Design a binder for this molecule. Structure first.
Ligand code: ZN
Lengths: 90, 4
């Protein structure tokens, strides 16, 4: 099961980005869709399922791509995007 | 991005 079941709802994850510092650069809508919530500290986000944390987001970064790059064993990522998608990033 |  998920590491943090309480953030399993995409709407709750989206609400967490109310003070996100990079709205133009990396859309909260995409981050929330990809399983991430904002920790509230700088640009640090975390996946509700694997609990993997990412920071130092750059212009044009794609949340799903970064999810697969750094946490390829996440079961939320696998269920959502499939194995072909993960393998292609690696 | 990079891991925390
Ligand atoms: Zn994950």
């Amino acid at each position: 099961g998920p590491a943090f079941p309480g953030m399993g709802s995409e709407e709750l994850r989206l609400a967490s980005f109310y003070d996100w510092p990079l709205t133009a650069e990396v859309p909260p809508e995409l981050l929330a869709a990809a399983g991430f919530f904002h920790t509230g500290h700088q640009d640090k986000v975390r996946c509700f399922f694997c609990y993997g944390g990412l920071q130092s987001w750059k212009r044009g970064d794609d949340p799903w791509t970064e999810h697969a790059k750094w946490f390829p064993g996440c079961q939320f990522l696998l269920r959502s995007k499939g194995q072909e998608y993960i393998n292609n990033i690696h | 991005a990079v891991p925390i």
